[PDB]
Every structure is written in structure tokens, then in C-alpha cells.
Amino acid sequence: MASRILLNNGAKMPILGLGTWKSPPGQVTEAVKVAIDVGYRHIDCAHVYQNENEVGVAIQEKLREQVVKREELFIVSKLWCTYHEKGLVKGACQKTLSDLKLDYLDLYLIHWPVGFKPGKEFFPLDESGNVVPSDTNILDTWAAMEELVDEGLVKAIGISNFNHLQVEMILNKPGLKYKPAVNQIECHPYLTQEKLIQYCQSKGIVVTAYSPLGSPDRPWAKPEDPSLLEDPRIKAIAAKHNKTTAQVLIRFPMQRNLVVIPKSVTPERIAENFKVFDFELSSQDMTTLLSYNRNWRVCALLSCTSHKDYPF
Ligand SMILES: NC(=O)c1ccc[n+]([C@@H]2O[C@H](COP(=O)([O-])OP(=O)(O)OC[C@H]3O[C@@H](n4cnc5c(N)ncnc54)[C@H](OP(=O)(O)O)[C@@H]3O)[C@@H](O)[C@H]2O)c1
Numbered sequence: 001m002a003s004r005i006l007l008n009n010g011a012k013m014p015i016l017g018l019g020t021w022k023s024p025p026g027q028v029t030e031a032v033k034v035a036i037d038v039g040y041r042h043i044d045c046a047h048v049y050q051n052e053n054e055v056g057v058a059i060q061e062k063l064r065e066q067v068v069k070r071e072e073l074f075i076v077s078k079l080w081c082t083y084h085e086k087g088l089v090k091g092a093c094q095k096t097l098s099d100l101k102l103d104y105l106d107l108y109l110i111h112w113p114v115g116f117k118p119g120k121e122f123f124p125l126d127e128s129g130n131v132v133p134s135d136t137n138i139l140d141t142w143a144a145m146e147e148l149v150d151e152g153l154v155k156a157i158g159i160s161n162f163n164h165l166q167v168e169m170i171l172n173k174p175g176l177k178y179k180p181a182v183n184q185i186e187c188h189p190y191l192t193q194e195k196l197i198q199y200c201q202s203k204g205i206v207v208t209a210y211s212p213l214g215s216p217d218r219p220w221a222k223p224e225d226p227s228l229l230e231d232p233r234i235k236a237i238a239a240k241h242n243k244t245t246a247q248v249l250i251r252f253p254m255q256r257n258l259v260v261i262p263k264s265v266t267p268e269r270i271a272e273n274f275k276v277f278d279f280e281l282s283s284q285d286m287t288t289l290l291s292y293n294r295n296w297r298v299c300a301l302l303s304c305t306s307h308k309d310y311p312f
């Protein structure tokens with residue numbers, strides 16, 4: 001299949017991108033250079049990942065080398081929770097643009113549907129360990145996102161980790177100017193997301209699947225947790241197709257009309273992970289992978305669960 005999906009802003013988005021959460025700053029410049037050299041045209045970034053400067057060094061060097069043109073890249077970043085205030089959104093976006101060495105983003109996402117108290121700390125806590133909210137709601141934050149489109153800073157805006165009702169809230173916003181182009185959510189065989197995906201796709205919102213390999217490097221991993229990459233049932237599908245388990249896990253969301261953003265800093269795996277456009281999972285394979293759903297989430301956070309807009 002086709003390498004790009006059409007968004008509701010009229011632009012095309014590469015269905016495979018490189019994730020950068022947890023990519024060490026001393027390794028991510030080379031990772032992104034290698035990715036672009038082996039064909040990646042989409043990089044998923046975020047201010048909270050603390051490595052955008054180093055991602056940007058790689059992007060800028062590949063543009064300077066003329067390995068790629070800017071118009072051929074699709075660079076995504078995300079507005080962190082401590083910048084859900086009207087007066088802070090532009091500067092947050094501009095800091096990300098500065099760090100990435102860009103004059104526009106292809107897509108800018110509200111990272112989570114929760115706002116936190118502004119300040120230096122990414123997770124401001126009260127003395128009992130609860131996150132300190134902002135009173136700013138998702139609709140006012142969305143209006144601020146829309147302004148970025150109208151100022152030329154970003155080509156598309158979207159959302160991430162929004163539940164059904166939250167997506168609906170944006171779609172139903174009085175005076176809505178731009179619909180979200182994308183909802184980026186966790187999705188893999190243990191968290192298949194059929195309901196939310198159906199909803200978003202029915203509204204013309206493209207879904208991006210994060211943690212498609214189950215995030216084995218997530219900092220809170222525990223022994224006992226399920227492991228996609230080690231699941232013998234998934235290994236068996238991979239062996240049948242003469243592919244790796246990771247390759248199956250990447251191809252799976254692609255065949256659901258999703259965008260997918262596996263992370264690696266390992267050159268061989270970066271290349272591996274891109275070699276997914278030359279085989280097809282059967283419908284039976286797809287349904288079998290869907291059957292592994294256990295509603296198991298990589299990405300949840302106890303400190304934020306009492307926020308009014310916590311999504312899960
Ligand atoms: N919007 C959000 O809230 C949100 C949340 C989570 C993630 N994301 C985005 O989604 C991206 C992907 O999710 P993720 O980083 O959580 O995890 P992931 O992509 O599911 O898994 C990354 C892990 O898998 C390993 N790996 C990669 N390719 C492999 C292969 N071929 N064989 C074996 N192991 C392989 C990586 O190791 P090495 O790097 O050592 O090779 C790393 O430990 C993130 O980096 C971020 O860009 C967004």
C-alpha cells in the first residue's frame with residue numbers, strides 16, 4: 001500500500017513515522033539521520049521529551065545535505081499540559097519550532113486533554129502528589145491551536161489521548177474553525193481501540209497509533225506485564241510471513257488505516273521497522289491480532305487521575 005494518508009486539511013501524512021520519546025539526546029540525532037537516509041519522512045516529537053533540539057540538528061542537516069526537501073518531511077510535535085493557556089500556546093509552539101530548526105510544523109497536537117498549572121515543572125504537584133490543574137478547558141485550548149494555523153506556524157492541528165466524549169466536545173465546539181486532523185492514541189494488539197478508532201474515522205479524523213510495540217523501554221515497566229514482542233502467538237504470525245515480530249506489529253495498524261510511529265535509536269531496527277510495505281497480513285491474521293485485546297495501557301499516570309479531564 002500507499003505510503004501517505006490524506007488528512008482533512010488537504011495535506012498528505014506518511015503512515016510510518018519515527019517515534020522519539022525516550023530517545024537519548026546523545027543518540028537521537030544519529031537515529032533521525034539514519035531514519036531519513038533509509039526512507040522515513042515523518043518524525044513524531046514533543047517538547048516534553050526534552051530532545052527536540054537534537055532531533056532538529058538531524059532534520060536541519062538532512063535538509064542542508066539535500067537528502068530531502070522540507071515539503072517532503074512531515075514533522076509533528078505536541079503542546080505540553082503546562083501550556084494550556086491562551087497566552088502561552090504561541091510561545092510553546094515557537095520554542096518547539098526554534099528547537100526543531102523549522103519555520104512550520106506539519107502537525108501540532110494537544111498532547112493530553114488535561115491542563116496543568118504553568119511553570120517550570122512539567123508535572124506541578126501539590127504537597128500530597130496530585131497534579132495541580134489549570135482551569136483552562138479543552139475548547140479554549142483548541143481556539144488557541146486554531147490561531148496557530150491562521151498565523152502560519154502549523155499546517156494542521158490535532159489532539160492526542162482524547163477519549164470519545166472529548167473528541168465529540170471539540171467537534172461540537174461552538175464556532176469551530178478547524179476540525180482536528182488527527183487523534184494520536186495508544187494502540188496495539190493488547191489495546192486495540194476498536195470503538196474510539198471507529199468513531200474518529202467516521203468523522204474523518206486520522207488516528208495515529210503510539211506505542212505499537214508495547215513500549216518495552218517505558219520507565220515504569222514491570223516484570224509481570226505482558227510483552228507483545230515476546231508473545232508466541234504474534235511470533236508465529238511473523239514466522240509465517242518471514243518477518244520479525246516488530247514488523248508484524250507495525251504492519252497491523254497500517255492495515256487498519258492508521259498511522260504508526262515506532263520508536264528506535266538502534267540503526268538496524270530503524271531500517272527493519274521501515275521494511276513493512278512489501279507484505280500483507282490476511283484478514284484472518286488481522287482478526288487474530290485484534291483478538292489479543294486486553295485493555296492494557298502503557299500510558300497512564302496515577303498522579304493525574306483526579307484531574308477533571310483525565311481521559312481514561
Ligand atoms: N501522544 C502520546 O501521549 C504518546 C505516548 C507514548 C508514545 N508516543 C509516541 O509514540 C512513539 C512510540 O511509542 P513508544 O516509544 O512508547 O514505544 P514503541 O515504539 O512501542 O517501542 C519502543 C521500544 O521498542 C524497541 N524496538 C524498536 N524497534 C524494535 C525492533 N525492530 N525489535 C525489537 N525492539 C524494537 C526500542 O528499542 P531501541 O530504541 O533500543 O531500538 C524501544 O525500547 C514514542 O516514541 C512517541 O513518539 C506518544
Ligand SMILES: O=C(O)COc1cc(F)ccc1C(=S)NCc1ccc(Br)cc1F
Nearest residue numbers: 021046048049050112114299300301304310
Ligand atoms: O506522554 C507521552 O508522550 C509519553 O509519556 C511521557 C513522556 C514524558 F516525556 C514525560 C512523561 C510522560 C508520561 S508520564 N506520560 C503519561 C501521561 C502524561 C500526562 C497525562 Br494527563 C496522563 C498520562 F498518562
